[PDB]
Amino acid sequence: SDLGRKLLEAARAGQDDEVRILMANGADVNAADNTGTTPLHLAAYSGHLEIVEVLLKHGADVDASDVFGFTPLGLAALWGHLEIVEVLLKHGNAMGSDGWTPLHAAAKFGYLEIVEVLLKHGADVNAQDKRGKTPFDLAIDNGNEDIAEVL
Amino acid sequence: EGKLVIWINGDKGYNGLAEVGKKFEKDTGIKVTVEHPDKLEEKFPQVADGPDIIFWAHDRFGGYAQSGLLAEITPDKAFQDKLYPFTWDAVRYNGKLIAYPIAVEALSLIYNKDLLPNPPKTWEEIFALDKELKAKGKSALMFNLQEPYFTWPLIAADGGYAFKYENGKYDIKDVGVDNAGAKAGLTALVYLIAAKAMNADTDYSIAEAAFNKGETAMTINGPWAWSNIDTSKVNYGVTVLPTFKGQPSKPFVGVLSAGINAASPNKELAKEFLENYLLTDEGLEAVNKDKPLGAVALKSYEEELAKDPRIAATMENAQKGEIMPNIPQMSAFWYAVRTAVINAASGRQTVDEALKDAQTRITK
Ligand SMILES: CC(C)=CCC/C(C)=C\CC/C(C)=C/COP(=O)(O)OP(=O)(O)O
Ligand SMILES: OC[C@H]1O[C@H](O[C@H]2[C@H](O)[C@@H](O)[C@@H](O)O[C@@H]2CO)[C@H](O)[C@@H](O)[C@@H]1O
């Protein structure tokens, strides 16, 4: 709770050594704040691969979601962190607050390699949202012909 | 008593107002006490411990006046001509003047030119802009998310509105809080939050500290905040707000006004103070030098300060937005949106849910 807050702070800030210390003093790997945000959520969205691997090594839940339904995989894909995405798919279509999957995000923001790895790992191309937009629909709407082509 | 108690919101130049009071005090012998209590706009109708004069944006004074909490001011034509007519229109309720207009305020985009030499023109850019800024240990934008005053310009961009104005009055049944425009604006904000591009617990103090310390490249605020940035040795620019759907953000234009309590035994001392001490180039200068007022209602001092580019940006953003209504239902408006925005922003409710409740509670 208190250490947990400090762990969320270090993970969000990218303090590999502070995370190392907090874990040494018994910090909870899966510490969740008010919004269900965990250290892995924060490390993934912030692009700190080293912390991501450490948390996973310590038993962090990869498929944890927040009140918005966002998983660490969704943030890594949303922020274009290919290497984190691969690690998260290494450890294991989850829809968000509007039915958007990590593939909707990668397509929306032109993360081609991420799209390739998601599809390579069983991403649902038919994933629909509230407006019935498939990741193909988002690729075309945002002018990502190339990623649309692979779809 | 035979005194003058004055209330003004803590984010204004109350030390400079206190200095106008001390000039009045010594010239007439009437002690003046300026206070800046928390939630003063809510305590005033509870206690009008009542102050002689209350300072606030005009939007809340129509609720005060309808409840009978304010006296009618008695300025003659000669004095009304000192201020711009549209400022009098904003402090007019049911055909009678219920307060003195002081200054016109609007929100503007404020950016740190060392982190952002050219600011974005759109809300869609902020997300990508924040990704490149966090590698530098910084943030893109940080402003008060606890008060809908600051998020409303985005909510009203695509179509949101408060109360429709028809044939001279505001229709209390035509509320645009649940329409598509407002859902679009608030959806963008909630996603910037869910994407961790914004923090939902961001309030005025956090945003001001972060910006004045060069930790975030942008913020949204009004004139009263400029002084604190000047002293922070931050190279900043005050410019138009980012567009949404290619459409401009529409901030609510408030008019800081001073209303006289009806229960005040000191209504003529209040008139003398407000009329002949505060609403002068010297009284307005004193308050403005403490914390800027924006485009003041006084024609002389406003015409004098008109060349300030930050004020020119202020009235440019105001020209995109709409003057606040003063009807008593505005209170319900601000209370419902505020709860909606904080619940959507935090995931407690969905944008549709939060805005559905709010629309109904305002149209009750
Ligand atoms: C901060 C942020 C952008 C978070 C996004 C949420 C997310 C993780 C994934 C999907 C977002 C998406 C496709 C938005 C617009 O779709 P659209 O093509 O229909 O565009 P529009 O509906 O806004 O017009
Ligand atoms: O958030 C609702 C709030 O917005 C306005 O208050 C502004 C005020 O106009 C500004 O001058 C500055 O002081 O910040 C306030 C918001 O924090 C409305 O005038 C007010 O009625 C309303 O409560």
Cα dist from B111 to B7, B54, B55, B76, whole Å: 31, 32, 29, 43
Q: How many whole angstroms separate alpha carbon B147 and alpha carbon B156?
A: 15
The architecture in CATH of the region A1-151 reads Alpha Horseshoe (1.25)
Whether A79 and B346 lie within 8 Å, measured CB to CB:
no
Ligand nearest to the CA of A94: 1
Is the distance from CB of B99 to CB of B105 less than 8 angstroms?
Answer: no
Looking at the DSSP assignment, which residues form a beta bridge with residue B35? B7
B148 C-beta neighbours (distance < 10 Å), count: 23
Q: Which of A67, A78, A79, A114 has most ligand 1 atoms within 8 Å of CB, for mutation?
A: A78
Whether A67 and B346 lie within 8 Å, measured CB to CB:
yes
Is the distance from CB of B169 to CB of B95 less than 8 angstroms?
Answer: no
- Domain CATH number, residue B93: 3.40.190.10
Tokens, residue A145: 């012909």
Tokens, residue A56: 């996973």
Whether A97 and B194 lie within 8 Å, measured CB to CB:
yes
* Strand B108-112 to B96-97 pairing: unpaired
Are B27 and B147 members of one domain?
A: no
Question: Cβ of A127 under 8 Å from any chain B Cβ?
Answer: no
Whether A46 and B134 lie within 8 Å, measured CB to CB:
yes
- Residue minimizing CA distance to atom 15 of ligand 2: B149
Q: Token pair 């020209």 is at which residue?
A: B319
CA B203, B205, B211, B213 torsion-angle sign: negative
Are B96 and B225 members of one domain?
A: no
User: Maximum Cα–Cα distance for chain A, whole Å?
Assistant: 50
In angstroms, the separation between the Cα of residue B58 and the nearest Cα of chain A is 37
In angstroms, the separation between the Cα of residue B149 and the nearest Cα of chain A is 24
Are B211 and B351 members of one domain?
A: yes
Helices (H), B195-280: 204-212, 226-230, 267-273
Q: How many whole angstroms separate alpha carbon B192 and alpha carbon B130?
A: 10
Are B14 and B153 members of one domain?
A: no
Is the distance from CB of B262 to CB of B48 less than 8 angstroms?
Answer: yes
The residues, ordered by sequence, that sit 6+ positions from A131 with a Cβ below 8 Å of its Cβ are none
Amino acid symbol at A81: H
Range of the domain at B294: 4-105+253-323
Among residues B297, B304, B315, the alpha carbon closest in space to that of B80 is found at: B297
Q: How many whole angstroms separate alpha carbon A44 and alpha carbon A114?
A: 14
Q: How many whole angstroms separate alpha carbon B125 and alpha carbon B109?
A: 14
- Ligand 1: which residues within 6 Å by Cβ? A 74, 78, 96, 100, 104-105, 108, 133, 138, 141-142; B 127, 191-192, 195, 197
Are B77 and B223 members of one domain?
A: no
Q: How many whole angstroms separate alpha carbon B288 and alpha carbon B335?
A: 30
Is the distance from CB of B55 to CB of B8 less than 8 angstroms?
Answer: yes
What was the experiment behind these coordinates? X-ray
Residues of A in contact with B200 (CB under 8 A): 35
Q: Sheet of B139-141: strands edge to edge?
A: B139-141, B216-221, B108-112, B236-239
Are B166 and B304 members of one domain?
A: no
Amino acid symbol at B80: Q
Is the distance from CB of B209 to CB of B108 less than 8 angstroms?
Answer: no
| d(CA B57, ligand 2 centre) in Å | 7
Q: Is B2 exposed, middle or buried (0-12, 13-18, 19+ CB in 10 A)?
A: exposed
Tokens, residue B277: 């001490």
Question: How many Å separate Cα A134 from the centre of its chain?
Answer: 19
CA A131, A134, A138, A140 torsion-angle sign: negative
Is the distance from CB of B342 to CB of B200 less than 8 angstroms?
Answer: yes
Q: Residue ranges per domain, chain A? A: 1-151
Exposure string of B229-240, with b = 16+ CB inside 10 Å and e = fewer, is: beeeebebbbbb
Are B125 and B96 members of one domain?
A: no
In angstroms, the separation between the Cα of residue A13 and the nearest Cα of chain B is 9
Question: Cβ of B348 under 8 Å from any chain A Cβ?
Answer: yes
In angstroms, the separation between the Cα of residue B133 and the nearest Cα of chain A is 11
Q: How many whole angstroms separate alpha carbon B352 and alpha carbon B363?
A: 16
Nearest atom in ligand 2 to B60's CA: 21
In angstroms, the separation between the Cα of residue B343 and the nearest Cα of chain A is 11
Among residues B364, B226, B349, the alpha carbon closest in space to that of B290 is found at: B226
Are B218 and B344 members of one domain?
A: yes
Q: Which of B11, B147, B331 has most ligand 2 atoms within 8 Å of CB, for mutation?
A: B147
Question: How many Å separate Cα B315 from the centre of its chain?
Answer: 13
Surface of A (19-58) touching B: CB under 8 A: 34-35, 42, 45-46
Are B28 and B77 members of one domain?
A: yes
Q: How many whole angstroms separate alpha carbon B187 and alpha carbon B182?
A: 8
Are B205 and B288 members of one domain?
A: no
| d(CA B148, ligand 2 centre) in Å | 8
Question: Cβ of A75 under 8 Å from any chain B Cβ?
Answer: yes
3-state secondary structure at position B45: helix
Are B232 and B148 members of one domain?
A: yes
- Residue minimizing CA distance to atom 2 of ligand 2: B149
B40 C-beta neighbours (distance < 10 Å), count: 18
Instruction: Provide the domain count of chain B.
Output: 2
- By CA distance, what is B196's nearest residue in A? A45
Are B8 and B90 members of one domain?
A: yes
Q: How many whole angstroms separate alpha carbon B295 and alpha carbon B306?
A: 7
Whether B196 and A68 lie within 8 Å, measured CB to CB:
no
Whether B195 and A67 lie within 8 Å, measured CB to CB:
no
Tokens, residue B27: 């010239």
Instruction: Outline where DSSP puts E strands in chain B.
Output: 4-7, 32-35, 53-57, 92-93, 96-97, 100-105, 108-112, 139-141, 164-166, 169-171, 216-221, 236-239, 252-260, 295-296, 322-323
Please report which helix (H) or strand (E) contains residue B101, including its range.
strand B100-105
B289 C-beta neighbours (distance < 10 Å), count: 14
DSSP A151: -
What does this entry list as its resolution, in Å? 2.2
